[PDB]
Subunit: 179 residues, 4 copies
């Protein structure tokens, strides 16, 4: 009765809008729907309940016994703990829809999406349009000073000129570490 759907892809691939589109179908069928998003839409009075959380554990603190469809956006902000949470919810008969990043800016697998992709019934990898060539993009390009971020530049970075854009694998560049 319950299953998991996984939506992934780079930044700017429309993951969040796709998650919302599928939750909206829940509303037209008069189902109860909620979405969880990291802390740090209605039709005929029935509405998507949105819920900000700091930790994946907060999900089970909510009463979900009457909820048909559970969304979870930006899953890369959580741990592999969210994997067992999502399996349990799907075994308790919920439709569960998770969205988040497949890779980080370096092109490295972004926990916990690998495992979610492996255990989910459905997987949809969305692609954006490369800011360079206009072909299908697959990667998130991080720029620091109009230049390709380095493999070892940290994610917390104070006062830096920082931008993100989608790129194809060919146009994606991770600059080498310094020494």
């Amino acid at each position: 009765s319950g299953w998991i759907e996984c939506i992934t892809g780079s930044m700017f691939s429309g993951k969040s809008e796709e998650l919302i589109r599928r939750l909206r179908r829940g509303i037209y069928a008069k189902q109860k729907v909620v979405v969880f998003k990291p802390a740090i839409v209605s039709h005929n009075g029935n509405a998507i309940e949105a819920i900000n959380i700091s930790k994946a554990s907060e999900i089970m603190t909510h009463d979900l016994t009457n909820v048909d469809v559970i969304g979870i956006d930006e899953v890369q902000f959580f741990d592999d703990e969210i994997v067992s949470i999502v399996e349990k919810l799907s075994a308790d008969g919920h439709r569960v829809i998770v969205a988040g990043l497949d890779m980080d800016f370096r092109g490295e697998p972004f926990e916990p999406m690998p495992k979610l992709m492996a255990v989910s019934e459905q997987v949809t990898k969305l692609q954006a349009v490369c800011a360079v060539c206009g072909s299908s993009s697959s990667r998130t390009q991080r720029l620091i000073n109009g230049k390709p971020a380095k493999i070892d530049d940290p994610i917390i970075l104070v006062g830096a000129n920082e931008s993100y854009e989608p790129r194809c694998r060919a146009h994606h560049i991770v600059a080498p570490s310094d020494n």
Copy 2:
């Protein structure tokens, strides 16, 4: 260089939201994007130009020489004429995205989506959630007086109690003609 993408499915399957999601990817790649819709969204100053039209012929009256991506929503409101228009635009190097109904309320193929599906590079049939059983829906149920519309009830209907909801083929009912 140009191609066609077709988005179809019943009412309430999210066709319009999916068309917008794909056009938004155009904006993040700094492409120029427009959408046409029947008469009767920005990021960094670059915006989807929306354009209401009465007739498919109006499309060619617009200057489209710098437009990367052309959307066309609710194509069932137009004729098979839109087929050659969309082939020409795709041959002139545009990415073209059409959305509309696959079938009418009777379950009959809704012109001009059949031909567009046949000539398009990509086809995506979206499914909603059946208002009866909660399975994947495929059809638009028309109700008149809380009852299934008849195969021959007209679409223009004055003063009637009229509703639409998505249903699976099993729960979709077209009532017989009277005599």
Copy 3:
């Protein structure tokens, strides 16, 4: 309980192999499966029954009361009659899988695939690889004397040097009529 799945695309896109792959899943689940193909695979003793036919009408002459899954390959060799046949079979609780051409060599919609795409629950447009550039192909290129067939060359053609290959829309060429 019954539905339709449509598999389409150009020649050489693997439609026939995809139809067989999906019918084989029927066998591993111990379902009874048949495939119809135009006239003019087992596992643990349970086998796909293959059936050659001249006319779509022959389908209803077969006893199908115990058949879970009905395949129909090369549907372009049949008429729009096959549309109501496939709707009836799906309404009688069968899973029905149709494969055939979306367009002919001219790029024109190939009856009866448009209507089938419109009324089917699922649609899968397969793409081959362009014999010229190696990108995703969408069209069937007909060659006569190492040259692009003409829009009006007939399909019955005696003694001619005739070849077919998949191409992208850009590399697909229909030569003009003579006068």
Copy 4:
């Protein structure tokens, strides 16, 4: 120029047949194609070169400079080492198609498919048909003595009555460990 396509799903979902179908499209476009499979199809004289291997490292020992398309079947028989091998081949301009199991019989993510799904441009999760209910399956059911394998039963098992069949999550059962 190069990319990765990932084909996954349970046993009996047709992963191997889908991998072959996509490699065959390479042949019709006159591309050179090879497939690697664990040790322990032609058209107009141009043929898929099949190659049995014990170790993922053997792949780089082969001369691949003229190969357009590289297949790799049953990737669960290899290590995460195959991840960097597949990224390198895709960065050297090859189309790479990997197939293998998403989960093991226990429902646990099957290395190295998680990471491959995360770094691949395309992901296709195929589904079989549940041997119990006939709905879409997602899991591989292991049976020992007509009974559900236990979470801790090993995979090497001498003289046991052992069968596998695809099941939906609901009908999939992992029996508890003994003590």
